[PDB]
Design a protein around this ligand. Structure first.
Ligand SMILES: CCN(/C=C\c1nc(Nc2ccccc2)nc2nc[nH]c12)CC
Ligand SMILES: [Cl-]
Length: 240
């Protein structure tokens, strides 16, 4: 419950740091938030926000472990699970640089496990840099507008559109809709046209990604219709 219980190993990004718990040596991360400039109105919005995050237990959602206070630093520490595979943005960037497309089995895993993550988020009522990989091929959802759906521009189905954009980009190594301006971008999104994902990928994968990118939210598949898809098999699910 105190910072003294953990030892910082190193900075991941800037603050995000990799840490080891002294009691058992568990590898975790935490996030540094300086609330030394927040109002009592912001710290109230911050406290409740975190306590909802505490409530989300699911194998495909990044797991929360602890929150720590240090009045002397005015620093809030949010302690979470470490995903050693990194984020998906980096996987995508890695693929452009080395001119190598991702396996369809990888894409099916992401599709399957992010859909179960969304299904859990919808019961309690999305971009490559917010999706993490652990050490066992599991996919975990954590936490210029390429993925903005037409409706959220003019709804659970809005998340299906974002999922659709994410999977497309894993396949094509670029988003479905690109532009140099916002109006140009919004132009292309509303027209709903894009290249087929590369031919190395099956017609069946292309079909479901294209369905998620439908202009009509009511034409996009639901979480349940996605998991019914013959492409999706037990081995694409999470495993301890
Ligand atoms: C802001 C910087 N990052 C933020 C958070 C983060 N990263 C990891 N793992 C991990 C990351 C990179 C290389 C290798 C591993 N795990 C996390 N778990 C929660 N947040 C995490 C992503 C670039
Ligand atoms: Cl898991």
């Amino acid at each position: 419950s105190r910072a003294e219980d953990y030892e910082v190993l190193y900075t991941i990004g800037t603050r995000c740091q990799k840490i080891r718990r002294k009691s058992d040596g568990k590898i975790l991360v935490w996030k540094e938030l300086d609330y030394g400039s927040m109002t009592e109105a912001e710290k109230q919005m911050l406290v409740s926000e975190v306590n909802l995050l505490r409530e989300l237990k699911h194998p495909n959602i990044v797991r929360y472990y602890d929150r720590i206070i240090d009045r002397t630093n005015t620093t809030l520490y949010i302690v979470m699970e470490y995903c050693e595979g990194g984020d998906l943005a980096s996987v995508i960037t890695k693929g452009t640089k080395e001119r190598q497309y991702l396996d369809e089995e990888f894409v099916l895993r992401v599709m399957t496990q992010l859909t179960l993550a969304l299904k859990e988020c919808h019961r309690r009522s999305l971009k490559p840099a917010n999706v993490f990989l652990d050490g066992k091929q599991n996919v975990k959802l954590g936490d210029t507008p390429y993925y903005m759906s037409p409706e959220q521009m003019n709804n659970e189905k809005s998340d299906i559109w974002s999922l659709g954009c994410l999977l497309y980009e894993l396949c094509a190594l670029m988003p479905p809709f690109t532009a140099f301006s916002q109006k140009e971008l919004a132009g292309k999104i509303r027209e709903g046209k894009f290249r087929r994902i590369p031919y190395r990928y099956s017609d069946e994968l292309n079909e479901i990604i294209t369905r998620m990118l439908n202009l009509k939210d009511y034409h996009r598949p639901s979480v349940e219709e996605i998991l019914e898809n013959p492409l999706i098999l037990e081995h694409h699910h999470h495993h301890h």
